[PDB]
Write a protein that binds this ligand. Sequence first.
Ligand SMILES: Cc1ccc(N2C[C@H]3C[C@@H]2CN3C)cc1C(=O)N[C@H](C)c1cc(-c2cnn(C)c2)nc2ccccc12
Ligand SMILES: [Cl-]
Ligand SMILES: [Cl-]
Ligand SMILES: [Cl-]
Ligand SMILES: [Zn+2]
Ligand SMILES: [Zn+2]
Ligand SMILES: [Zn+2]
Ligand SMILES: [Zn+2]
Ligand SMILES: [Zn+2]
Ligand SMILES: [Zn+2]
Length: 310
Amino acid sequence: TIKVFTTVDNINLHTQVVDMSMTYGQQFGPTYLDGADVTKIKPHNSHEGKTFYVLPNDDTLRVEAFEYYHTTDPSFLGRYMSALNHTKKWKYPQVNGLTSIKWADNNCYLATALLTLQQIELKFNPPALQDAYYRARAGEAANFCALILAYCNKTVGELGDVRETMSYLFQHANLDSCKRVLNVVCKTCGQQQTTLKGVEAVMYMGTLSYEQFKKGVQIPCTCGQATKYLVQQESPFVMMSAPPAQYELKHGTFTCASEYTGNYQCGHYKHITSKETLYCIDGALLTKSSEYKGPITDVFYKENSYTTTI
Ligand SMILES: Cc1ccc(N2C[C@H]3C[C@@H]2CN3C)cc1C(=O)N[C@H](C)c1cc(-c2cnn(C)c2)nc2ccccc12
Ligand SMILES: [Cl-]
Ligand SMILES: [Cl-]
Ligand SMILES: [Cl-]
Ligand SMILES: [Zn+2]
Ligand SMILES: [Zn+2]
Ligand SMILES: [Zn+2]
Ligand SMILES: [Zn+2]
Ligand SMILES: [Zn+2]
Ligand SMILES: [Zn+2]
């Protein structure tokens, strides 16, 4: 026999006692240790005193599960533990003061998102996301990367899009105060203004230039071509995205950007960040230059309050 702590959040610990004749699944259900499925494994002598993750099987664990993860998905823990088994083996080197990831298991899009998150202002709603976010900014990013995969319904090795990953993460963050007011001017229909809140207010797909979005872009109208432009923007940042194309990044005019080279889906991401000079972070590799020209698909800008002059 061995005394054992079970948990769903690694906060509230529930004392249990097991007999070593029965595997952990026979007494706790699906059980995990440091990301390893110890369900069909009988208790060992070193397993005494440790804390294990268990699938919620009573109401107390279900409530503690939601309050920490903000999900009731019964598959979340398993997917989370399965990713952590890989992410805990990745290397997370410090590059230019930022925590990056050495290349492994097609994680280039995860490293780019990780580096981007360390340069924009985000408050995550699930306490599990926020705690791992803090630990990741301090260098321990294995649990944060595993949570990103689980929250995005992606597995280790799967090909990932950075813009889609940031969008899913934005939906789990507090962006209620974010507001975008647009105005569409059609030659026949007239003018009409709409207001966007939340995640829809901080992302645009179509162009990389924040200035071009302020000056207006061409969109088709219901009557078959109108023009939309940005009237007001209330957000700590904006994300401008477009299909990969050659683009010149000027120092001091942007926060960071996503470079994408190669074919659709199976390409490779690099991260460009604007400090005292332009830096390029490719996993564990770092290069710098005063100017940059390359295939860019995401650009991030700082913002607070903006009102047009039209
Ligand atoms: C690396 C990766 C992993 C997965 C996926 N997937 C897309 C769909 C299916 C799967 C998952 N998602 C549900 C895509 C890419 C990818 O390649 N991302 C680059 C930036 C890219 C984006 C676009 C684009 C995006 N939105 N729009 C109108 C266009 N076009 C591209 C065209 C050529 C080359 C790169 C392009
Ligand atoms: Cl929620
Ligand atoms: Cl691995
Ligand atoms: Cl949430
Ligand atoms: Zn929530
Ligand atoms: Zn692996
Ligand atoms: Zn890659
Ligand atoms: Zn979710
Ligand atoms: Zn109309
Ligand atoms: Zn019209």
